[PDB]
C-alpha cells in the first residue's frame, strides 16, 4: 500500500489528560491504548 | 490499496480525557482502545 | 509500503498530562500506551 | 518500506507532564509508554 | 527500509517534566518510557 | 447556623476534566462554576 | 456560624485537568471557577 | 465565625494539570481560578 | 474569626503542572490563579 | 482573626513545574499566580 500527495493540518487546542493515542495520520501498523 | 490527493483539516478544541484513540486519517492497520 | 509527498502541520497548544502517545505521522510499527 | 519527500511542522506549546511518547514522525519500530 | 528528502521543524515551547520520550523523527528501533 | 459531629468519606477515582466545582462539604457561601 | 468536631477523608485518585475548584471542606467564602 | 476540632486527610494521587484551585479546607476568603 | 485545634494531612503524589493554587488550609484571604 | 492550635503535615512527592502557588497554610493575605 502506497500513500502520497497529502496535506494535513492538525490542531489540539486543549487536552486534559490522554491515556490513549492521538495520531494525525497512520498509514498502517497497530496502536493500542 | 493506494490513497493520495487528500486535504484534511482536524480540530480538537477541548477534550477532557481520552482513553481510546483520536485519529485524523487511517488508511489501514488495527487500533485498539 | 511507500509514503512520500506529504505536508503535515501539527499543533499541541496545551496538554495536561499524556500517559500514552502523541504522533504526528506513523507509516508503520507498533505503539503501545 | 521507503519514505521520502515530506515536510513536517510540529508544535508543542505547553505540556504539563508526559509519561509516554511524543513523536513527530515514525516510519517504523516499536514505541512503548 | 530507506528514508530521505525530509524537512522537519520541531518546537517544544514549554514542558513541565517528561518521564518518557520526545522524538522529532524515528525511522526505526525501540523506545521504552 | 452551626455544623458539627460529621464523618465524611469522599472518593474521586477518575475525572477527565472539571470546569466547575467538586466539594466534599459546604456549610455555606457561594460557589460559581 | 461555627463548625467543629468533623472527620473528613478526601481522595483524588486521578484527575486529568481541573479548571475550577476542588475543595475538601468550605465553611464559607466565595469560590469562582 | 469559628472553626475548630477538625481532622482532615487529603489525597491527590495523580493530577494532570490544574488551572484552578485545590484546597483541603477553607474557612473563608475568596478563591478565583 | 478564629481557627484552632485542627489536624491536617495533605498528600500530592503526582502533579504534572499547576498554573493555579494548591492549598492545604486557608482561613482567609484571597487567592487568584 | 486569630488562628492557633493546628497540626499540619504536607507532602509534595513530585511536581513537574509549578507556575502558581503551593501553600501549606494561609491565614490571610492575597496570593496571585
CA J27 to chain centre: 10
> Is D18 within 8 Å of E19 (Cβ atoms)?
yes
What's the DSSP call for residue J14? -
Method by which the model was determined? cryo-EM
* CA–CA gap between residue A26 and residue C28 (Å, rounded): 7
Residues 1-33 of I with CB under 8 A from J: 1-33
Which residues sit opposite H8 in a β-bridge? G8, I8
Rama region for E19: left / alpha / beta (φ>0; ψ in -120 to 50; rest): alpha
CA distance I23 to chain H (A): 5
Beta-strand runs (E) in chain H: 2-12, 15-18, 21-26, 30-32
> Which set of grid coordinates corresponds to residue G6?
468533623
* CA–CA gap between residue A30 and residue G16 (Å, rounded): 25
Tell me the helices (H) and strands (E) count for chain A, helix number first. Answer: 0, 4
Given the C-alpha cell 499566580, which residue does it identify?
J33
A 10 A CB-CB count for G6 gives: 23
Q: What distances in angstroms separate CA B18 from CA A21, A22, A33, D20, F15, one per listed residue?
A: 8, 9, 10, 14, 11
Rama region for D17: left / alpha / beta (φ>0; ψ in -120 to 50; rest): beta
What's the DSSP call for residue J12? E
Given the C-alpha cell 528528502, which residue does it identify?
E5
CA distance D1 to chain C (A): 5
Query: Following DSSP, what letter does each residue of F1-33 receive, concatenated?
Result: -EEEEEEEEEEE--EEEESSEEEEEESS-EEE-
Set of chain F residues whose Cβ sits within 8 Å of the Cβ of A16: 16-17
Number of CB pairs < 8 Å for H and I?
122
> Is E23 within 8 Å of D21 (Cβ atoms)?
yes
* CA–CA gap between residue H32 and residue F30 (Å, rounded): 12
List the subunits that have 3+ CB pairs under 8 angstroms with F: A, B, G
Sheet with A21-26, strands from edge to edge, namely B21-26, A21-26, C21-26, D21-26, E21-26
* CA–CA gap between residue C31 and residue C20 (Å, rounded): 9
- Which of E12, E13, E17 to mutate against chain J (most J CBs within 10 Å)? E17
Domains and CATH numbers, chain C: 1-33 (4.10.230.10)
User: Resolution limit in angstroms?
Assistant: 3.5
Q: What distances in angstroms separate CA J22 from CA B10, B11, G7, H22, J15, one per listed residue?
A: 37, 34, 24, 10, 10
* CA–CA gap between residue D5 and residue D16 (Å, rounded): 33
Question: Cβ neighbours of residue A10 under 8 Å, at least 6 residues apart?
Answer: A24, B10, B24, C8, C9, C10, C11, C24
Set of chain G residues whose Cβ sits within 8 Å of the Cβ of B16: 16-17
Q: Do J6 and I10 touch (CB under 8 A)?
A: no
> Is G13 within 8 Å of H15 (Cβ atoms)?
no
Beta-strand runs (E) in B1-33: 2-12, 15-18, 21-26, 30-32
Q: What distances in angstroms separate CA B24 from CA B9, D8, E28, one per listed residue?
A: 8, 15, 23
Chains I and H: 3 or more CB pairs within 8 Å of each other: yes
| Burial F5-22, CB ≥16 within 10 A → b, else e | eeeeebebeebbbbbebb
Amino acid at each position: 500500500y502506497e500513500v502520497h500527495h497529502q496535506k494535513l493540518v492538525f490542531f489540539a487546542e486543549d487536552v486534559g489528560s490522554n491515556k490513549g493515542a492521538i495520531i494525525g495520520l497512520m498509514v498502517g501498523g497497530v496502536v493500542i491504548a
